[PDB]
Design a protein around this ligand. Structure first.
Ligand SMILES: [Ca+2]
Ligand SMILES: [Ca+2]
Ligand SMILES: [Cl-]
Ligand SMILES: [Cl-]
Ligand SMILES: [Cl-]
Ligand SMILES: [Cl-]
Ligand SMILES: [Cl-]
Ligand SMILES: [Cl-]
Ligand SMILES: [Cl-]
Ligand SMILES: [Cl-]
Ligand SMILES: [Cl-]
Ligand SMILES: [Cl-]
Ligand SMILES: [Mg+2]
Ligand SMILES: [Mg+2]
Lengths: 290, 549, 549
């Protein structure tokens, strides 16, 4: 596992700057061909409840203690939605990063519906409450009396099972659950997310993280599944422009992955993309027609 | 307030029901003193003028649109003195107040009608429209056709029929009687003397009836409206008259009056088809229903202004405007199961959009940037829901949700004494949706809405600017410029649920720097090549077009 | 307060945690100023003395029973000055205050212990019990046998073992050191000088250890308690010492001291088996578990008093008292699935009784009419629930539920900052169970409880009267008389869930008129025939026996 990734992403958003993310990735040494990093959206190891750091090698070492959200949760596992104060745009942004950065991602049960946590149950047990299936008795997790549950479900107005549960989210295509499921389906159809190279694109705007991922491509392939992918992520809460030097991909057609809309072909000039606050885009880079 | 004959063109209105806003006296019903105590909130939100639906004495059989006494406040709201207190407190904060005034009819409990029926030879005998038969005016449709067997009702005391375009307990006033015209002018002056900033005049297309006509929009009706405007112009400069005419926009222009005078009837009238067209544009992911309705709207007098709002129905009749001949979308509304389910029922913005925050922002952005003066409906700024079972109108008239406390903080009374209950469901209930909970985070719908109002207020282009639709490569995106001459703004709106690119020909503004209005980030300057903007699903951007050094 | 050496015999106590009652400073934690602001409620309820669990500076690893500084208030509660403010405000209302004081041990964070381990040859070197081996005192049981491998722990700094009857972070004080005895007497005097009305002395059976004994209840332990009583008697007359000895009642009598002096140790001690016996009496629908425990309780000194409460566990150790040899119900508790489920967990009254209002009233009536001074636990008067997952003790330490507002009106802080969350379930949640909601109807549990306290306060017989069990035809009914000599009261209690008749031989009071104490209705006068009373399931009656004219 690559433990510092989430703390750095968290700080990149707090700071509205790509560098804490750019840096841990750049400074991560290469690993054997056979091997893979695991990544996840947590700030603590579940065994010891410690956040990884390093006095000598982490340029952000002293900065975590200066963030009051970071400080408040020291030594406590928290779910994704609570870590992000239930901001739907940020949940999507962090999830997009988890699904497109190098490594194999681990989703934690319940984060796909935006479950909360109950900190008073304990530093680990905070995130171990029952899966919220329905708005029924015990959140549909059990037919037992409530007093016999191993732990209680969330019952507050924001995260409680009357409001947050699988059944309620299954219907709307716009629920967090349906959005997450679609992102997973999209990822599964593009090999570059799983085993692609990683090329950080820099760019004019320090508030935007942009990268391309590529498959080396050997024997009997050629199709969307092995086309290169371009990911652009706005770490600022405000709308941001970014101009990218994609000249090596001149002539390629960026196709946005969720709605399949063709964007203008890449030229020799800088390519302008505009993002809303905390927004992101995923594009398939399609080879042009001869 | 110091006279300012254009204030209504720059105003954002806030429709707020006295009964619903705040109960200061613990009787379970909102009141004028309560509304006065909440003016700091209204000022903070950033709206410019309150619009109060009828608060006159009334038996409340048709929501208070059935008036028993034009000169008296409904007792549970307070008295005329409480109204003046409210007026003065609002003016002190720079907020104006207008109210609904029903011109066409009174309640049958009105003393004029009771005198008309009991004493036909008396001074009120001809104050209403009476007949030995129910045969006159047969070409007039019955508005409430599922409820009223006829526009004529037989009175058992007078033993003649009387005319009513609305319900039978709402007899029509006889405007062919000169004493009726003077009495109604006197009602206007009474409230204007108290200091009210204007009125929405309701049911005015129906004032006069004539054989051989459908008894709407008659020239004598417009003539009386000219008398109202003249009284305003001569005696109370700087006040406003708004027309409630639920008609196709081309037909409504008549209500602004004679163009050769710069307008001599109503200062404002509502553009009813706007929301149905925006709603269908999003359903179809096409800018055309919006483009077309705006392009086909005729010019109005330069001192006049359209009013616009995010509702699909007129609150008086619960009808959606349409036109078999001039509305290309005429047959399309019935094909949409969302439109079909809500026929004849007022719904709030969040429920109309299935509580989709992205769409709520998109529709609000359009409301605040399209031509006209917008009306916000109380509670939409926090995303309140409705309770359809309460009635077709009462659906959206539940108490304002101030806190997660008992009665949503609207009242100290017992819950069973409230005039209507608050929402209590998991999505819209006051335990989760209320002003208090949204005050803190800068990312709440309330703070987002407040910020958008602040941004709009800093650009005169939104209020009185020209409107130029930019077209563009992509029919899923609506882009336009608002301009006044020194202040130019670019608005781009994605009607598709998916991310969309748009290339705009902005050559006329080459060299200009687009500055995004929420974060103030400077975008690449406009050149001679088409300008690419990329939007997320249902997203929008507002840009100030800044002149180069 | 003016000295009154019997106040504790007439008192109803109210156990209230500073952290839980009211947060006046919006940090999410109850505080002394907050408790002070709620004294009007406490006065209105009608209780006579607050009992505060430990509020001293502490790392809170064992609920604050692990004390870091006896002279300092936990900073989040306030300071000693806030405590004096609370004391003065309570006294002004005629309310007294006692607090828990742990005598046996301190936290390992206490400066005495840190000096003891770091500087063995220094003045604190012998303040704790140190040994080169873990062999001493092998007959002493390990109280927390599932957690602590031994009563001796090896200290890595001093490199010797130290003794602890409780957790390893709670080293035992060495009472064989005369400086330790003086230091602890000085702690008593410090709080008494501030004006506190007394202490519950905790863990006192464990003070001294001796080879060849189980290291509880030693004569030297009682000797030190006599020093405490003497200091009180000589320097602060009118203050009280309460013993927390979780032992069979026969063994506890020793803690009142020498009967020949009228008692020379604690003024009060708790009768722990009472609730388990009442609970089993109702489960079995038989008066015998209650009759027997009362009959088998030995006489205590006349200036002394039992304390009683509706809990099945001691809050320090989470153990239920019992005795293999002297408790006939010894093997019976395990056969009851309700008792079995809650072993080692504090539960509130309503949850113990499955929220059955009839039983809550029955158990409360018994608490208020049986011999002793009763302790009410905060929140039981409105029927609060608990949250067992918070911990075996923290289960019953959630915030007081004042209103249905945010955080149950306990705090203005954000919910995530509360020290513990309020109940949120459909039965016990603050949306339905709170003080505000119960203030109105005279039939709420809160008003019922308040009225019962008012009634009890008007009859000295309940506090200091004799106790005569009347027997009677029906073993399902418990009937008794409390009398003081001029004030005589008859209490009848139905332990069965079904209606029950009881015929009582009341000949000794023939001619007397029973007046029911809630409605004041006069019942038929007592004659020579047995007096029939009929009760509904779980019902009770209190009668004043009034002398005839
Ligand atoms: Ca008419
Ligand atoms: Ca000891
Ligand atoms: Cl882990
Ligand atoms: Cl974590
Ligand atoms: Cl109203
Ligand atoms: Cl009045
Ligand atoms: Cl309307
Ligand atoms: Cl509507
Ligand atoms: Cl406490
Ligand atoms: Cl202190
Ligand atoms: Cl206890
Ligand atoms: Cl207990
Ligand atoms: Mg009222
Ligand atoms: Mg506090």
């Amino acid at each position: 596992f690559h433990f510092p990734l989430m703390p750095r992403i968290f700080m990149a958003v707090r700071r509205e700057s790509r560098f804490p993310i750019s840096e841990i990735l750049a400074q991560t040494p290469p690993i054997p061909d056979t091997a893979q990093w695991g990544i996840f959206l947590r700030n603590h190891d579940e065994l010891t409840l410690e956040m990884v750091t390093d006095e000598e090698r982490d340029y952000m070492y002293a900065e975590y203690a200066k963030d009051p959200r970071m400080k408040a949760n020291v030594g406590i596992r928290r779910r994704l939605a609570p870590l992000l104060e239930n901001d739907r745009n940020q949940i999507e942004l962090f999830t997009a990063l988890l699904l497109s950065l190098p490594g194999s991602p681990v989703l934690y049960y319940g984060d796909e519906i935006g479950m909360g946590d109950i900190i008073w149950l304990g530093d680990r047990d905070s995130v171990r409450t029952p899966m919220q299936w329905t708005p029924d008795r015990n959140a549909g997790f059990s037919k037992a009396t409530p007093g016999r549950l191993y732990l209680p479900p969330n019952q507050d107005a924001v995260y409680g099972y009357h409001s947050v549960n699988v059944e309620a989210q299954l219907d709307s295509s716009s629920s967090l659950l349906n959005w997450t499921r679609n992102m997973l389906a999209v990822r599964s159809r593009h090999d570059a997310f799983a085993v692609g190279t990683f090329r950080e694109l820099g760019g004019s705007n320090p508030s935007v993280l942009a990268y391309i991922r590529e498959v080396t491509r050997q024997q009997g392939d050629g199709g969307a599944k092995t086309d290169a992918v371009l990911c652009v992520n706005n770490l600022s809460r405000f709308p941001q422009p970014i101009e990218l030097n994609l000249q090596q991909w001149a002539g390629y057609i960026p196709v946005e992955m969720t709605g399949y809309v063709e964007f203008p072909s890449i030229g020799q000039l800088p390519y302008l993309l505009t993002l809303p606050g905390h927004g992101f885009y995923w594009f398939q880079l399609r080879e042009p027609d001869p | 307030l110091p006279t300012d004959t254009n204030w209504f063109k720059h105003a954002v209105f806030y429709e707020v029901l006295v009964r619903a806003f705040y109960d200061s006296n613990a009787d379970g019903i909102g009141d004028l003193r309560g509304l006065t105590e909440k003016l700091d909130y209204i000022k903070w939100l950033g709206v410019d003028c309150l619009w109060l639906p009828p608060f006159y004495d009334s038996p409340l059989r048709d929501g208070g649109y059935d008036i028993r006494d034009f000169y008296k406040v409904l007792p549970e709201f307070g008295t005329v003195d409480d109204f003046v207190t409210l007026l003065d407190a609002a003016h002190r904060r720079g907020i104006r107040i207008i109210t609904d005034l029903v011109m066409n009819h009174t309640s049958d409990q009105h003393e004029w009608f009771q005198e008309s029926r009991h004493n036909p030879d008396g001074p009120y005998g001809d104050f209403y429209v009476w007949s030995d038969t129910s045969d006159r005016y047969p070409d007039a449709r019955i508005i409430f056709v599922d409820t009223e067997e006829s526009n004529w009702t037989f009175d058992p005391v007078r033993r003649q029929f009387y005319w009513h375009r609305f319900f039978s307990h709402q007899p029509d006033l006889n405007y062919d009687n000169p004493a009726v015209q003077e009495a109604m002018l006197d009602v206007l002056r009474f409230w204007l003397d108290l200091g009210i900033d204007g009125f929405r005049l309701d049911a005015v297309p129906y004032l006069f009836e004539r054989e051989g006509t459908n008894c709407e929009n008659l020239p004598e009706t417009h003539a009386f409206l000219k008398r109202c405007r003249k009284a305003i112009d001569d005696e109370y400069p700087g006040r406003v008259l708004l027309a409630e005419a639920n008609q196709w926009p081309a037909d409504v222009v008549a209500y602004f009056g004679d163009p050769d005078t710069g307008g001599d009837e109503c200062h404002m009238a509502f553009h009813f088809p706007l929301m149905p067209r925006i709603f269908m544009a999003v359903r179809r992911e096409s800018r055309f229903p919006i483009s077309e309705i705006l392009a086909q709207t005729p010019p109005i007098p330069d001192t006049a202004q359209w009013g616009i709002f995010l509702r699909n129905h007129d609150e008086l009749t619960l009808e959606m405007v349409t036109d078999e001949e001039r509305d290309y979308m005429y047959a399309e509304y019935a094909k949409d199961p969302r439109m079909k389910a809500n026929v004849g029922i007022r719904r709030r913005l969040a429920p109309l959009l299935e509580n989709d925050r992205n769409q709520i922002e998109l529709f609000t952005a359009l409301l605040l940037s399209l031509p006209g003066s917008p009306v916000l409906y109380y509670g939409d700024e926090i995303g309140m829901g409705d309770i359809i079972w309460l009635g077709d109108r009462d659906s959206v008239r539940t108490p304002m949700q101030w806190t997660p406390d008992r009665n949503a903080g609207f009242s100290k009374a017992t819950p069973g004494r409230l005039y209507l209950p608050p929402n209590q469901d998991a999505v819209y209930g006051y335990h989760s949706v209320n002003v208090e909970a949204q005050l803190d985070s800068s990312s709440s719908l309330l703070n987002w809405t407040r910020n958008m109002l602040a941004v709009r207020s800093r650009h005169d282009a939104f209020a009185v600017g020209t409107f130029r639709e930019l077209g563009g490569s992509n029919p899923s995106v609506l882009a336009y410029i608002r301009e006044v001459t020194t202040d130019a703004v670019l608005c781009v709106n994605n009607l598709s649920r998916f991310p969309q690119p748009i290339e705009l020909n902005l050559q006329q503004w080459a060299g200009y720097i687009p500055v995004e209005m929420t974060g103030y980030v400077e975008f690449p300057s406009i050149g001679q090549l088409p300008y690419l903007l990329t939007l997320p699903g249902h997203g929008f951007y507002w840009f100030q077009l800044r002149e180069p050094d």
